[PDB]
Amino acid sequence: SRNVDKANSVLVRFQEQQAESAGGYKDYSRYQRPRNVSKVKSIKEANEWKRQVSKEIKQKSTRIYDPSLNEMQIAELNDELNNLFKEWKRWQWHI
Amino acid sequence: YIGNLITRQFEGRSNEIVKTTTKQRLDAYYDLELRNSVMDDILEMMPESIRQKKARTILQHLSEAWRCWKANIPWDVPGMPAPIKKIIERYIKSKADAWVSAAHYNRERIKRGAHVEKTMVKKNLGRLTRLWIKNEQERQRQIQKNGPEITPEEATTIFSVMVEWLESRSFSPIPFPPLTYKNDTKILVLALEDLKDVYASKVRLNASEREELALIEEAYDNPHDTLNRIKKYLLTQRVFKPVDITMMENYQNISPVYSVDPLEKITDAYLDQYLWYEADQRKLFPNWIKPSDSEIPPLLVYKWTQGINNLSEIWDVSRGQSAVLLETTLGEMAEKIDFTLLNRLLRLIVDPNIADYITAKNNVVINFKDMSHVNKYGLIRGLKFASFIFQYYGLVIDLLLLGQERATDLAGPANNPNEFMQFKSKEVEKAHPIRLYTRYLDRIYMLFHFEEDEGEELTDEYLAENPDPNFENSIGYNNRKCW
Amino acid sequence: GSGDLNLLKSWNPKLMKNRKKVWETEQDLITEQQKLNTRLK
Amino acid sequence: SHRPQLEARSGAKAAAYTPTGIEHARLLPGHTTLKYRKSWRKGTAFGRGYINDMTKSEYHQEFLHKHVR
Amino acid sequence: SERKAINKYYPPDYNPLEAEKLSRKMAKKLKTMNKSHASIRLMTPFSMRCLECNEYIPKSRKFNGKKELLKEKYLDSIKIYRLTISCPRCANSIAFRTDPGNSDYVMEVGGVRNY
RNA sequence: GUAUGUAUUUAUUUU
RNA sequence: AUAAAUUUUUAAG
RNA sequence: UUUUAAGAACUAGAUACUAACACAUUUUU
RNA sequence: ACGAAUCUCUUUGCCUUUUGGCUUAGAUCAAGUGUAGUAUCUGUUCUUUGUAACAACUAAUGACCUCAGAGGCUC
RNA sequence: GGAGGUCAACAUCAAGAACUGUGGGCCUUUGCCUAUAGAACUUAUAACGAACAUGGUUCUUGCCUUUUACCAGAAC
Ligand SMILES: [Mg+2]
Ligand SMILES: [Mg+2]
Ligand SMILES: [Zn+2]
């Protein structure tokens, strides 16, 4: 079974739930948006959520200019860009 | 250990790491040394210039010549400088000899059954089937160049013997099946069943087998039609499809397995069934040819002992009397049969249509992977009716052994044939030295009842042509080690 | 390893555990629709 | 992308590396001291060496004549 | 660290059902567990023809591919899945359906079947 | 016998 | 008038 | 600017991933 | 008239992007299974005193002064 | 100067039933013969240990898909 199963097991999670309470781990490479901006919390945190966006801005930004030729594909990817960049705007606005 | 673990943990593992030859990577190295050794020579024969292109090329010619040596194909190159061909012939002869010797060695290592790997059994099987077919093709070619071994005289003698018998019995050549046959439907049902029972118990059916079962089903739906097609093949078709050989292993013997194509299998089965029915119906085979129907083999042995005892006087030590049993394998039998003769001796017994058919059916291309050769000489024992042929020919040998008279004594009169062990008078028994004779497939068992006169005569002539001053006949003499 | 990997996975309908499931559910629904047809008559 | 080899590795390379110092199993000292020199018959039908090759030899046809049955 | 491993060291406290609760809360926030999608290695039973580069997936070919639980449910209750496969020559996704009532597959979006 | 691979730059090097 | 007693497990693929 | 997810409590019960390994299957009705 | 040089084309020579391994042809061409190993989830409900009067209080930018950015005043 | 030490270093401990030194004669130092002095420790149902483990190579097996890990005998 692919490690997708093995990384999500209880014995993996529980130590993360201890590291949140005992220290400064818990990533932000895991969770998603969180959907709403104004519901985010103290600045030292949204700081990391923001880079957790800019990185994808860089990946797909590089993924723009590529000759690989799928124009419909780069169209939807282009819209995805605009969406994310708007999110970046939102995270800045909250800060 | 921990010394290595820790010093390796600080200092990293050794960068050299040479690795020795062992059981798994051996063959690879052997290849490697060989191709190198040919590189040297064929580079040193050439006058000056060219290397890498002619390198790769010449080594390719090596590989090809080896493959063609496995396949028995002679590997002539339309042009190539002769000395190179000398070299490559040399090295591939070498590799050949080492390869064969490994085949023998591994085989006689398996017969003892000590620690042979799961694969080496398979591989060794492969090498043995290759070598066996090579011996076969050798034998056939040398039979062409050297001509048949039967000679015209001996052949005439044989055919004469058989004719004399078949008149002595007043035998009718079997009729070819009528277009309308009263028992024909009954026989057909059995033959299709006997093919079906292979597939009743199978699980996974390959493509050829499924095609077969289609032919069987369509054969039930149109018995009259499939008769029409079958007999039509009996007449028209003298040329047949090739036949595959896959040697199956008994872990000591390796035995062949012939696999024919379904259409041919059907006519072969019907013709077989027919021949056995008509043959036993006309009482062709006498009593004493018995791998037969009515008796299972242990019952055969029991009746053979009771046969020994019940007949008179054998245990009498009264003066000089003695007795002998011969157990003789006929040796190669199916491999020495010849078709020019078969066609005739089947002409006697059977209509020339079926005889010619059978005769032709044995000459077919035989295919195992690469190896292929026409079968020009011996019998193919895998045909459904190879039974009948084989027994009939056996009879032809037995008439040589027993002579006409004594054979007519055993089989008795055509009016009332005897049973397995019987006679008319005890006189007819005592009138001849041979008392009991039976042939179970290859094996021949003979019984002789001798008295001082006849026995001392026999040893007089035998010793008369074989002087044995040192009394050493008993050195090379073999006997039972079980008791 | 020779034959089809599909036989060794659950989702494919062609193998005999799932074909039997479909047999059973379809058979039950045949019973139900049969009885409900007889009721309306 | 399998290839024959068209070369070997020259030990000169391994000569310039530095030794690791791992201790093997077979290099533990052993054999540590040298050694110095100082009517029935009348009815019958019929009356009365080294080849060099592997396949055509006699032992071979004995072999395959047997193990094939 | 053996492939077949009987025990796994646990922290000295570890209320297991409590970890089931807290982990059950944790299961919502993760990206992977919630993907609604799936990835499976599989074969092509019916072969193929691509509708973009007209490439032929000849009979049965390994693929790293994507399984999805379909919102349909065959009859009253039977599961039905939709698989996707990328083409080797071009970037194109072709999909399947598994008909439980008719054992064979039926497919859509980007490929056609050979007869 | 549960692959494997690529990328994951935050803190701004003198015109 | 007999006192005759083999074994036994882990990893990797 | 836009947007709604997160927490607490309750319920009954089985399902996914991997195929590298072995595949004469034989046979008693 | 031939000697010499450039361009173009044809023929011969060289051959230029000119098949890079071994093992049972490496094995196989299937309405079919076994066996071994690893891991846990889906639904519902709930949550996100009035009026009037009197008194007191309520960060950014610019300018000026002083001290070595801070303080005070005004708008 | 005596007693000791759970102190150290350097010698010696498997062989013609066997050690070492010395005197004398022959060969030409070695070696042989003869004479003399001293020999701790270990050895005859053979050995420093009144005890008792493991490893390497090579063969023979035993388990038996393959390698480590192994089964029980031998030689070095
Ligand atoms: Mg592997
Ligand atoms: Mg291996
Ligand atoms: Zn395509």
UniProtKB/Swiss-Prot annotation, chain A:
Top-rank lineage group of the source organism: Eukaryota
GO cellular component: catalytic step 2 spliceosome; cytoplasm; post-mRNA release spliceosomal complex; post-spliceosomal complex; Prp19 complex; U2-type catalytic step 1 spliceosome; U2-type catalytic step 2 spliceosome
Keywords: Cytoplasm, mRNA processing, mRNA splicing, Nucleus, Spliceosome
Subcellular location per the Swiss-Prot or TrEMBL entry: Cytoplasm; Nucleus
Statement: the UniProt record of this protein carries the keyword Transcription: no
GO biological process terms on file: generation of catalytic spliceosome for second transesterification step; mRNA 3'-splice site recognition; mRNA splicing, via spliceosome
Note: Present with 1990 molecules/cell in log phase SD medium.
Family: Belongs to the ISY1 family.
The protein's role, per its UniProt record: Involved in pre-mRNA splicing and cell cycle control. As a component of the NTC complex (or PRP19-associated complex), associates to the spliceosome to mediate conformational rearrangement or to stabilize the structure of the spliceosome after U4 snRNA dissociation, which leads to spliceosome maturation. The cell cycle arrest of SYF2 defective cells may be due to the inefficient splicing of TUB1. Also involved in DNA repair.
Self-association state and partner proteins as the record states: Belongs to the NTC complex (or PRP19-associated complex), composed of at least CEF1, CLF1, ISY1, NTC20, SNT309, SYF1, SYF2, and PRP19.
UniProt-recorded name of the protein: Pre-mRNA-splicing factor ISY1
Lineage: Eukaryota, Fungi, Dikarya, Ascomycota, Saccharomycotina
Annotated gene: ISY1
Swiss-Prot record, chain C:
Intracellular or extracellular location(s): Nucleus
Subunit structure: Belongs to the CWC complex (or CEF1-associated complex), a spliceosome sub-complex reminiscent of a late-stage spliceosome composed of the U2, U5 and U6 snRNAs and at least BUD13, BUD31, BRR2, CDC40, CEF1, CLF1, CUS1, CWC2, CWC15, CWC21, CWC22, CWC23, CWC24, CWC25, CWC27, ECM2, HSH155, IST3, ISY1, LEA1, MSL1, NTC20, PRP8, PRP9, PRP11, PRP19, PRP21, PRP22, PRP45, PRP46, SLU7, SMB1, SMD1, SMD2, SMD3, SMX2, SMX3, SNT309, SNU114, SPP2, SYF1, SYF2, RSE1 and YJU2.
Family: Belongs to the CWC25 family.
Functional note: Involved in pre-mRNA splicing.
Miscellaneous comment in the UniProt entry for this protein: Present with 861 molecules/cell in log phase SD medium.
Name of the protein this chain belongs to: Pre-mRNA-splicing factor CWC25
Organism of origin: Saccharomyces cerevisiae (strain ATCC 204508 / S288c) (Baker's yeast)
UniProt lineage: Eukaryota, Fungi, Dikarya, Ascomycota, Saccharomycotina
Gene this chain is encoded by: CWC25
Residue range from the parent sequence: 2 to 42 of 179
Swiss-Prot record, chain D:
InterPro entries: Cwf_Cwc_15
Localization per Swiss-Prot or TrEMBL: Nucleus
Region (Disordered): 1-17
Family: Belongs to the CWC15 family.
Biological role stated in the UniProt entry: Involved in pre-mRNA splicing.
Subunit details: Belongs to the CWC complex (or CEF1-associated complex), a spliceosome sub-complex reminiscent of a late-stage spliceosome composed of the U2, U5 and U6 snRNAs and at least BUD13, BRR2, CDC40, CEF1, CLF1, CUS1, CWC2, CWC15, CWC21, CWC22, CWC23, CWC24, CWC25, CWC27, ECM2, HSH155, IST3, ISY1, LEA1, MSL1, NTC20, PRP8, PRP9, PRP11, PRP19, PRP21, PRP22, PRP45, PRP46, SLU7, SMB1, SMD1, SMD2, SMD3, SMX2, SMX3, SNT309, SNU114, SPP2, SYF1, SYF2, RSE1 and YJU2.
Official protein name in the record: Pre-mRNA-splicing factor CWC15
Underlying gene: CWC15
From Swiss-Prot, chain E:
Gene that this sequence comes from: YJU2
Domain of life: Eukaryota
Family according to the record: Belongs to the CWC16 family. YJU2 subfamily.
General function of this protein: Part of the spliceosome which catalyzes two sequential transesterification reactions, first the excision of the non-coding intron from pre-mRNA and then the ligation of the coding exons to form the mature mRNA. Plays a role (via N-terminus) in stabilizing the structure of the spliceosome catalytic core and docking of the branch helix into the active site, producing 5'-exon and lariat intron-3'-intermediates. Further stabilizes spliceosome conformation for 3'-splice site docking (via C-terminus) promoting exon ligation.
Complexes and interactors: Component of the spliceosome. Present in the activated B complex, the catalytically activated B* complex which catalyzes the branching, the catalytic step 1 C complex catalyzing the exon ligation, and the postcatalytic P complex containing the ligated exons (mRNA) and the excised lariat intron. Interacts (via C-terminus) with CLF1. Interacts (via N-terminus) with SYF1. Interacts with U2 snRNA; this interaction is direct.
Compartments reported by the entry: Nucleus
Protein's recorded name: Splicing factor YJU2
Interval of the full protein contained in this chain: 2 to 116 of 278
Further comment found in the protein's record: Present with 2250 molecules/cell in log phase SD medium.
Positions of Zn(2+) binding: C50, C53, C87, C90
